[PDB]
């Protein structure tokens, strides 16, 4: 089989900045190299094909060259949009095969989160369970912390986060962490806490409730 | 237009067998070669096989011609892959995508996706709770949301305001808990308007549950 090697596994840069990812084939492939960018959760999408042809609705910031062994996909600005895994694949013998990806991120500038909290609903307490919520909305960079406090008591084990792909139109962030307690550990405490440190505050912040 | 349209996400047990679809539209279906590509944790993208629907001759990659039996069905316009012997390394998003017309050697279209979830776990749909606005903090931004919890397998879909609500809008990826269910929170960031009504519309394929919940302060 012809394997293909994309480097590097994985980039930063900053809007409007070029970006160039390559690919090679372990043998000559001719010019049968196509390219596909892939968002989080959606179908690959063709970009360029043929080495250096443009796909339909594909802006002229993305191109590609190459020849034989080895080839080179180039954004010449980077933007917002472009944030996604891109995958080289070779069209020229079965079985077809596809480079292992690039994933292109975003550097801008630190962004400090909003910070919200949320307790578990009447709803959910009525099931046995107690589920307490705190977003930290639109950061930059993704390295954040968060603790959580149960009547001015660190919390550990009982907390997950989930984090955002980077956000397409303004780069930034946005994570979950939630806190699952027994309905019978939540009905014993009254104070609930949440604390946020991140490189955009000056200072640790605290958004709390008193069940 | 173009359209590859996928059939649903499933769970299926360890040692069963699953057909997954792919309906073609907008275009002559006998011209153009249907690929089956599959998309595994940390394996990457991989090519399966082909199907050239006019003649139904098949084409596989040596790594799944066990695995895999692709067909066509050239008077409902739809190609299928059924996977045999499942085991939990098959567990992946399953993608169909046609192959560019010749000179275009390239998978120019693709469907949507098909996640199968190999395990003996039931499917299992989510609880959805409303995740209020605190009564605090009315500079004008406010946030509330909904809790997806408790189902089985991926994935769930969040919309607000049937698609109408779409700024502010923050659809976590679904994380895993130590029970084996999957939950997510979707949240969205309002100027403390309420007076707006909010609805977060969620949908679960694989177990065909749909949830609207209202998020009321």
Same mark, same amino acid.
């Given at each position: 089989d012809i394997q293909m090697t994309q480097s590097p596994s994985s980039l930063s840069a900053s809007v409007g900045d070029r970006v160039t990812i390559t690919c090679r084939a372990?043998?000559?492939? #001719?010019?049968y190299l196509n390219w596909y960018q892939q968002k989080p959760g959606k179908a690959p999408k063709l970009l360029?094909?043929?080495? #250096?042809r443009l796909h339909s609705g594909v802006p002229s910031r993305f191109s590609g060259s190459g020849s034989g062994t080895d080839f080179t996909f180039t954004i010449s600005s980077l933007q917002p949009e472009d944030i996604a895994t891109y995958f080289c694949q070779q069209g020229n013998t079965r079985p077809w095969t596809f480079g292992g990806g690039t994933k292109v991120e975003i550097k801008r500038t630190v962004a400090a989160p909003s910070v919200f909290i949320f307790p578990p609903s009447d709803e959910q307490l009525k099931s046995g369970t107690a589920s307490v919520v705190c977003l930290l909305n639109n950061?930059?960079?993704?390295e954040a912390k968060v603790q959580w406090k149960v009547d001015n008591a660190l919390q550990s084990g009982n907390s997950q986060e989930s984090v955002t792909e980077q956000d397409s139109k303004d780069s930034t962030y946005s994570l979950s962490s939630t806190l699952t307690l027994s309905k019978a550990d939540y009905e014993k405490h009254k104070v609930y806490a949440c604390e946020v440190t991140h490189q955009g505050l000056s200072s640790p912040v605290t958004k709390s409730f008193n069940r | 237009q173009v359209q590859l349209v996928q059939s649903g996400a499933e769970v299926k047990k360890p040692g069963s067998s699953v057909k997954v679809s792919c309906k073609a539209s907008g275009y002559t279906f006998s011209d153009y070669v249907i690929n089956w590509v599959r998309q595994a944790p940390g394996q990457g993208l991989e090519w399966m096989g082909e199907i050239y629907p006019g003649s139904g001759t098949n084409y596989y990659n040596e790594k799944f011609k066990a695995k895999a039996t692709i067909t066509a069905d050239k008077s409902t316009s739809t190609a299928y892959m059924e996977l045999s012997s499942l085991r939990s390394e098959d567990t992946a998003v399953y993608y169909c995508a046609r192959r560019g017309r010749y000179?275009?050697?390239?998978?120019d279209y693709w469907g949507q996706g098909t996640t199968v979830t190999v395990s003996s776990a039931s499917t299992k749909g989510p609880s959805v709770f409303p995740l209020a606005p605190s009564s605090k903090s009315t500079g004008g931004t406010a946030a509330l949301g909904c809790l997806v919890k408790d189902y089985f397998p991926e994935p769930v879909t969040v919309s607000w305001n049937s698609g109408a609500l779409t700024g502010g809008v923050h659809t976590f990826p679904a994380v895993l808990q130590s029970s084996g269910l999957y939950s997510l929170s979707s949240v969205v960031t309002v100027? +403390? +308007? +309420?007076?707006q009504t909010y609805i977060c519309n969620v949908n679960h394929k694989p177990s065909n549950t749909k949830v609207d919940k209202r998020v009321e302060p």
């Open positions: 372990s043998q000559d492939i #001719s010019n360029i094909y043929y080495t #250096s950061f930059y960079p993704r | 000179g275009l050697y390239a998978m100027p +403390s +308007s +309420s007076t």
